[PDB]
Amino acid sequence: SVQWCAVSQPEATKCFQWQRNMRRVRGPPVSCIKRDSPIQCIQAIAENRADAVTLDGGFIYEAGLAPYKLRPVAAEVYGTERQPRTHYYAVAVVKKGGSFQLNELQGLKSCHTGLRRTAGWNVPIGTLRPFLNWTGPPEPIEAAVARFFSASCVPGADKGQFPNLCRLCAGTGENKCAFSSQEPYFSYSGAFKCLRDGAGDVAFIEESTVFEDLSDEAERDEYELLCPDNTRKPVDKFKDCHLARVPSHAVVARSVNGKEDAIWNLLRQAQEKFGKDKSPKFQLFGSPSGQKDLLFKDSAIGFSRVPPR
- Is 255 annotated as catalytic? yes
Please identify which of the residues 31, 69, 96, 279 carries the catalytic annotation.
69
Shortest reach from residue 213's CB to Fe ion, in Å: 16
Number of residues near Fe ion (by CB under 5 A): 2
Specify the residue, 118 or 164, whose C-beta has the smaller distance to Fe ion: 118
Shortest reach from residue 248's CB to Fe ion, in Å: 8
Please identify which of the residues 37, 255, 287, 304 carries the catalytic annotation.
255
Specify the residue, 58 or 184, whose C-beta has the smaller distance to Fe ion: 58
Residue from the set 11, 56, 76, 293 that interacts with Fe ion by CB under 5 A? 56
Shortest reach from residue 158's CB to Fe ion, in Å: 21
Specify the residue, 278 or 298, whose C-beta has the smaller distance to Fe ion: 298
Strands 87-95 and 202-206: antiparallel
Helices 38-46 and 57-64: crossing angle in degrees, nearest 10, is 30
Closest by CA to 232, choosing from 96, 107, 39, 133, is: 96
User: What does the alpha-carbon distance between residue 155 and residue 58 come to, in Å, rounded to a whole number?
Assistant: 14
User: What does the alpha-carbon distance between residue 185 and residue 154 come to, in Å, rounded to a whole number?
Assistant: 9
Neighbours of 236 (CB within 10 A): 14
Shortest reach from residue 38's CB to Fe ion, in Å: 12
How deeply is 173 buried, as exposed, middle or buried, from its count of CB atoms within 10 A (0-12, 13-18, 19+)? exposed
Shortest reach from residue 250's CB to Fe ion, in Å: 10
Residue positions forming the annotated binding site for Fe(3+): 56, 88, 188, 249
Interface positions, 126-155, toward Fe ion (CB under 5 A): none
Specify the residue, 284 or 300, whose C-beta has the smaller distance to Fe ion: 300
- Is 69 annotated as catalytic? yes
Specify the residue, 100 or 211, whose C-beta has the smaller distance to Fe ion: 211
**Which range in 49-57, 197-205, 257-265, 288-296 contacts Fe ion by CB under 5 A?**
49-57
Which residue lies nearest Fe ion, judged by its C-beta? 56
User: What does the alpha-carbon distance between residue 285 and residue 177 come to, in Å, rounded to a whole number?
Assistant: 26
3-state SS string for 96-142: CCCCCCCCCCCCCEEEECCCCCHHHHHHHHHHHHHHHCCCCCCCCHH
Residue from the set 118, 189, 208, 299 that interacts with Fe ion by CB under 5 A? 118
Closest by CA to 151, choosing from 135, 163, 139, is: 163
Catalytic residues: 69, 255
> For binding to Fe ion (CB under 5 A), which residues are involved?
56, 118
